[PDB]
Design a binder for this molecule. Structure first.
Ligand SMILES: [Mg+2]
Ligand SMILES: [Mg+2]
Ligand SMILES: [Mg+2]
Ligand SMILES: [Mg+2]
Ligand SMILES: [Mg+2]
Ligand SMILES: [Mg+2]
Ligand SMILES: [Mg+2]
Ligand SMILES: [Mg+2]
Ligand SMILES: [Mg+2]
Ligand SMILES: [Mg+2]
Ligand SMILES: [Mg+2]
Ligand SMILES: [Mg+2]
Ligand SMILES: [Mg+2]
Ligand SMILES: [Mg+2]
Ligand SMILES: [Mg+2]
Ligand SMILES: [Mg+2]
Ligand SMILES: [Mg+2]
Ligand SMILES: [Mg+2]
Ligand SMILES: [Mg+2]
Lengths: 141, 82, 100, 206, 67, 80, 62, 145, 143
RNA sequence: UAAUUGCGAUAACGAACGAGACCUUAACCUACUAAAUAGUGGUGCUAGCAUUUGCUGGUUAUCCACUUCUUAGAGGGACUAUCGGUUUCAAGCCGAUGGAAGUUUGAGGCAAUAACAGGUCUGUGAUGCCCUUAGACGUUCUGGGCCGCACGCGCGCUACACUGACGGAGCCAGCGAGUCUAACCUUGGCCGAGAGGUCUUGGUAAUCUUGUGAAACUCCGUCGUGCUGGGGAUAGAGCAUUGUAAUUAUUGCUCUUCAACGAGGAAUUCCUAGUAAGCGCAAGUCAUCAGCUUGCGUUGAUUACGUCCCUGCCCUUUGUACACACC
């Protein structure tokens, strides 16, 4: 057996299951490396867990993610949460907390939702209006 | 049938599309002393059209007069090569 | 054999009771089986205007029937098998057994 | 700096932007100190972001919007006037092009230009309405530092939107010349002209 | 508003009146014992009652309280 | 044929049945009994059988061209 | 163009019929420990710093 | 990429099919000012007449022009699949035509006075100046003239 | 080091394969090129027009390599768009079926894609071979 | 206090309904039970590139292991917890910390007493009375009309453009529906520019349609401030589908014609976060027809966190010549 963990990152409806094991350290997004997410502005949003901790920590571990659901923006935030969660959970299972403790305050001081999925969920649409809160229009004369 | 306004017209600018030899060499000396070159730069200046402002912009690349920093479509940003 | 028992009730308490009796029947009949596989609950929504006529504020109303489905795969001779069909019947519980 | 190769080929530019200095796409968040007082810790610098897109939540509390970076606040005001509601990826791309144009012209830091634009065009006095009765009357009041920043972002983005409407100039360059003129002070930007006429009304209605 | 209703307050008052040599200033052990010492139909009500008893233990430990 | 059978059972707690009491109120009114007298007997019978509260409402034309409603009840009933 | 910086030290309350104007008392950084009362259009917090075109003002409720 | 200087043979607005064809803009949209030629027909006519679409119509020599208007007036000879045509199976001869500059409103009037003189519903609807395609006329088309 | 179609960017790969098939020029010409709109929602034909049977063939070649099997029905869903139905609001409409069918029939002729069980078409060894070579060509042109 | 919510005071004590409590739903669970009708990893067979270990795949009777992601059943969790202030210092309130979640956690369902001479006899084989009952106001057939247009209004949809239009590429959801004495949702192959037609297939359904490859979106290109390639009303010719039947065009398609509209006057509506707004999709009615509604997802702002000025609501005091009650 090989040292392997698995995590998931979440968004509105996008889930990204990341398989983190030991190896040379390729990172793949559903078939393809990190440089080909292609919003090309949220591409640098996905580099953010990697660029915060240095690329030396990723030299021993390879991560493969499978992202479904949501849209293009929401899938990006599912990846960047799954990368940080998978990196932490590997350092839970196999190496010391001294990496972990400096990993988590590096994440949480910068951006909180790197490790935790945000609680904002859609509100149901209500009758008498097009949206959750709005109404149609009132007429009197 | 009420306008509820006056709807004043415009000045009817007459930007020419095709260039000529007098307009050809005009962009050669005058592209230097522009600190920033784009399609909108070459239209608010001398009155060539937007399409030739793209074609003559790509023309300046194969020889090299002005330098790139970004090559996004719909916004081409171009500075002077010193 | 590879028969399946599918339960499609709308009351969850009797359906879990019937499912529990079936899986505890095969347990004392020492049979290696597929567990109670739980399908997603079907929510049948019907939205209607509350008003009989068309007067008043446009107030709507969504009635809803929740159907819960569960199936267990079992592998036993027919003399055993016909007796699960004989037992474990509850009100509002639809019990079906198919072969292969 | 140390070049590290890896199974997926990491470019050097994203490597240099990672370890050397935490940047924008190419811009730095240092030496961007705001010279104008009373607006410190209400314009957000020293908190770096790589891109203006962040899924933060600042509408939960009252003064939480002050902690949002001023680049992201500019992109949020850029997506306005109806059909541009949402579409934040266009707002970031417009801002990225705008900061490039603020680099080739007026070669100082584009982050330093926008924070000078915010501070110069922020109205320090304005007028409210008293109970008019027969006729409404204006009364001059002072402006909070939060509202000074909020008015500055709104005035800059409105003037750029009106300038780019129905003309050949794009939204990126019209916003750039609005931010350049507001940082200088010229009474030709729409932001400055609205500020002085608001303070003139406040002066005559004390 | 987090004002507690009289059903929570009186259920807390009856437990304080009756089981002082018992549940303490920790909410977790109070919830784990007020569930069996009182038949409460709702988990939301049980946490509300156990919460207010703990608030009453804190009040009791600093002087007497009325009622 | 043979797939249908019907069983008849005596209903437990005859006083604790709204549908049995509604028909008891229904046939008493068309027999000729007073509306107040028929309701008060039904409301008395429901709590005598071991209920917590009862309420009978009669609506329609009673002794007048104009229609109204009277509500006979005792005990307590929840609504929400 | 003389301007004067003042620091909000205690928020007094809302004023104006529609409630949009806040009564505050402010402490001047220069010429320390002499304080006046002003009116603020926007959201004003403790330790906010105000700049005033003129400091010769008392605040009366609108 | 490359920019030619200018030709002495460039001309402003020109004459085809007794229409005032606007020069100064691109050829595909230049032929669209001719009534009977839209965006699809002008794009296809220029494709079969092997002119480059990038060139402005104000600069074009002779022998391409009457070649272009020949394909216009004789479409089916130059491999037009007859579902591009405006007026196919006409009303009289069953053939496939493509009406043009002074023909489009000509065939418009003669269909109408035929429809008026046959006393069909569409004729008297056009005679009265009302909507004919079944549109509601209670609340629309009020400022009709 | 191992080259796949996933290893290179999508946009420059399709451009490379369309240019390669332009440089070769051997697929098919259906006959009704430069007359068709490629969907019911389009209103005027593709602006390129010296091709686009080769951009479309390149796009479906990568797309077949992506998935297991597609038919003409899945391609019309993919290449459809919002149709401006005049005054009425926009709606998704399907793409034109004859182009995608004749692309696949042309794609079958060379041997770049083959028929499959469970319906549809599927990449094979010779098919993905030509895909993988230019995929290797696609990332050495940066050098 | 959101709350006749509570502290308390007290000629009142003990009560009841409403509020709350309750129920449903969205969040967390790497803790339980499992799951070829959901998946994941490994092992077989096999395709390719590099070949040096590897990468990307395919594979139903190839097995093995597991439930993190996915579905449920049973549960746990949050009670404003801890800390710091403020209040007769009681109910509480404010800030920070931890937490998935600390605006009664979010959104609903239920919802008192008394009423309106509100709406509905055109939902009912629910109805009292009045009318009509064989040239019937019964029912049924045929053809029309409900759409008719000198105009006035209400809810809406497209827009007046470069934060754009168009063409290529890129490429992602969720709610949900579907055939029996019927003929449904349709995959795949073939023909046709298109709409659509034909030969089949799967599915009574977490299995098949369907990963509903949705649209706004991203990236390359063309145009270029011109009522212009903006916008697509009004017309003309033809090709198909539904239906016995489409003529006052049902709808879809192809070509042509290319009107107002240059941001909207007096006025007026909705809205405090995944909300407004932009964008589509499913269902409802349905043989055909969404510019409507009920919901769902995608992208996702600005600006207060207040007040009683306007329009109204609740409680107390007060004056009243008001009682179908300030109309
Ligand atoms: Mg909405
Ligand atoms: Mg403009
Ligand atoms: Mg497309
Ligand atoms: Mg295999
Ligand atoms: Mg609630
Ligand atoms: Mg009725
Ligand atoms: Mg009748
Ligand atoms: Mg009608
Ligand atoms: Mg309405
Ligand atoms: Mg597009
Ligand atoms: Mg889905
Ligand atoms: Mg158009
Ligand atoms: Mg739109
Ligand atoms: Mg429908
Ligand atoms: Mg309707
Ligand atoms: Mg109002
Ligand atoms: Mg008096
Ligand atoms: Mg009186
Ligand atoms: Mg009066």
């Amino acid at each position: 057996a090989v040292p392997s963990v698995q995590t998931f990152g979440k968004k509105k409806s996008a889930t990204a299951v990341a398989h983190v094991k030991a190896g040379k350290g390729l990172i793949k997004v559903n078939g393809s490396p990190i440089t080909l997410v292609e919003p090309e502005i949220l591409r640098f949003k996905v580099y953010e867990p990697l660029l915060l901790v240095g690329l030396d920590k990723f030299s021993n571990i390879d991560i493969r993610v499978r992202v479904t659901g949501g849209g293009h923006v929401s899938q990006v935030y599912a990846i960047r949460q799954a990368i940080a969660k998978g990196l932490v959970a590997y350092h839970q299972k196999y190496v010391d907390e001294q990496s972990k403790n400096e990993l988590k305050k590096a994440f949480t001081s910068y951006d909180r939702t790197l490790l935790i999925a945000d609680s904002r969920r859609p509100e149901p649409k209500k009758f008498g209006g097009k949206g959750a809160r709005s109404r149609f229009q009132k007429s009197y004369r | 049938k009420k306008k509820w306004s006056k709807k004043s017209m415009k000045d009817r600018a007459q930007h020419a599309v095709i260039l000529d030899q007098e307009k050809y060499d005009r962009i050669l000396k005058e592209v230097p002393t522009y600190r920033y070159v784009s399609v909108s730069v070459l239209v608010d200046r001398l009155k060539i059209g937007g399409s030739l402002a793209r074609i003559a912009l790509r023309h300046l690349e194969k020889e090299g007069i002005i330098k790139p920093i970004s090559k996004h479509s719909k916004q081409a940003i171009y500075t002077r090569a010193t | 054999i590879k028969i399946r028992i599918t339960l499609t009730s709308t009351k969850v308490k009797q359906l879990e009771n019937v499912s529990s009796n079936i899986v505890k029947n095969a347990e004392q009949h020492n049979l290696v089986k597929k567990g109670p596989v739980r399908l997603p609950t079907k929510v049948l929504k019907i939205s209607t205007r509350k008003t009989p006529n068309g007067e008043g504020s446009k107030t709507w109303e969504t009635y809803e029937m929740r159907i819960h489905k569960r199936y267990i795969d079992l592998e036993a001779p027919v003399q055993i098998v016909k007796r699960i069909t004989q037992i474990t019947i509850e009100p509002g519980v639809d019990v079906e057994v198919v072969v292969a | 700096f140390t070049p590290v190769v890896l199974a997926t080929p990491i470019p050097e530019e994203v490597q240099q932007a990672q370890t050397e200095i935490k940047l924008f796409n190419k811009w730095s968040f240092e030496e961007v100190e705001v010279k104008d007082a009373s607006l410190v810790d209400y314009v957000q610098v020293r908190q770096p972001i790589f891109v203006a897109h962040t899924a933060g939540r600042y509408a939960n509390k009252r003064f939480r919007k002050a902690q949002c970076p001023i680049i992201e606040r500019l992109t949020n005001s850029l997506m306005m006037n109806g059909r541009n509601n949402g579409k934040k990826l266009k707002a970031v791309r417009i801002i990225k092009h705008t900061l490039d144009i603020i680099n080739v012209l007026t070669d100082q830091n584009p982050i330093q230009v926008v924070v000078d634009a915010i501070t110069n065009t922020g109205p320090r006095e304005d007028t409210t309405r008293v109970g008019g009765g027969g006729a409404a009357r204006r009364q001059a009041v002072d402006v909070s530092p939060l509202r000074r920043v909020n008015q500055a972002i709104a005035l800059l983005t409105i003037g750029a939107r009106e300038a780019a409407f129905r003309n050949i100039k794009t939204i990126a360059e019209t916003l750039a010349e609005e931010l350049i003129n507001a940082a200088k002070g010229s009474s030709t930007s729409y932001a400055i002209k609205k500020k002085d006429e608001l303070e003139r009304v406040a002066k005559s209605n004390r | 508003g987090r004002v507690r209703t009289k059903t929570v307050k009186r259920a807390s008052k009856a437990l304080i009146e009756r089981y002082y040599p018992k549940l303490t200033l920790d909410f977790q052990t109070n919830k784990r014992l007020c569930d069996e010492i009182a038949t409460i139909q709702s988990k939301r009500l049980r946490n509300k009652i156990a919460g207010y008893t703990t608030h009453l233990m804190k009040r009791i430990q600093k002087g007497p309280v009325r009622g | 044929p043979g797939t249908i059978v019907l069983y008849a059972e005596r209903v437990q707690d005859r006083g604790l049945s709204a549908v049995a009491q509604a028909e008891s109120m229904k046939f008493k009114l068309l027999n000729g009994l007073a509306i107040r007298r028929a309701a008060y007997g039904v409301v008395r019978y429901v709590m005598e059988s071991g209920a917590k509260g009862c309420e009978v409402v009669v609506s329609g034309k009673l002794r007048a061209a104009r229609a109204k409603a009277m509500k006979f009840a005792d005990g307590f009933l929840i609504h929400s | 163009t003389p301007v004067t910086l003042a620091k909000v030290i205690k928020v007094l309350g809302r004023t104006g019929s529609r409630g949009g104007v806040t009564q505050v008392r402010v402490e001047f950084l220069e010429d320390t420990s002499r304080t006046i009362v002003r009116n603020v259009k926007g959201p004003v917090r403790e330790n906010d710093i105000l700049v005033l075109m003129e400091s010769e003002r008392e605040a009366r409720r609108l | 990429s490359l920019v030619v200087q200018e030709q002495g043979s460039f001309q402003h607005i020109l004459r085809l099919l007794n229409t005032n064809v606007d020069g100064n803009i691109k050829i595909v949209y230049a032929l669209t000012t001719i009534k009977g030629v839209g965006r699809r027909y002008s794009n296809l006519v220029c494709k079969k007449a092997d002119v480059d679409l990038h060139k402005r119509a104000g600069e074009l020599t002779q022998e391409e022009l009457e070649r272009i208007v020949q394909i216009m007036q004789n479409p089916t000879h130059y491999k037009i699949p007859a579902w591009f045509l405006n007026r196919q199976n006409d009303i009289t001869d069953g053939k496939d035509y493509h009406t043009l500059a002074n023909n489009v409103e000509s065939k418009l009037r003669d269909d109408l006075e035929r429809l008026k003189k046959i006393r069909a519903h569409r004729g008297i609807r056009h005679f009265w100046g009302l909507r004919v395609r079944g549109q509601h006329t209670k609340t629309t088309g009020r400022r009709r003239a | 080091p191992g080259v796949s179609v996933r290893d290179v960017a999508a946009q420059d790969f399709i451009n490379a394969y369309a240019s390669f098939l332009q440089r070769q020029g051997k697929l098919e010409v259906p006959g009704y090129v430069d007359i068709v709109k490629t969907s019911s929602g389009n209103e005027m034909p593709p602006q390129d027009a010296e091709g686009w049977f080769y951009k479309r063939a390149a796009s479906v070649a990568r797309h077949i390599y992506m998935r297991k099997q597609v038919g003409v029905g899945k391609l019309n869903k993919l290449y459809g768009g919002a149709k401006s139905r005049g005054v009425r609001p926009y709606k998704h409409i399907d793409a034109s079926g004859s182009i995608n069918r004749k692309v696949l029939q042309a794609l079958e002729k060379i041997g770049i894609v083959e028929i499959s069980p469970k319906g549809g078409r599927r990449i094979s060894e010779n098919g993905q071979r030509d895909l993988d070579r230019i995929a290797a060509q696609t990332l050495e042109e940066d050098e």
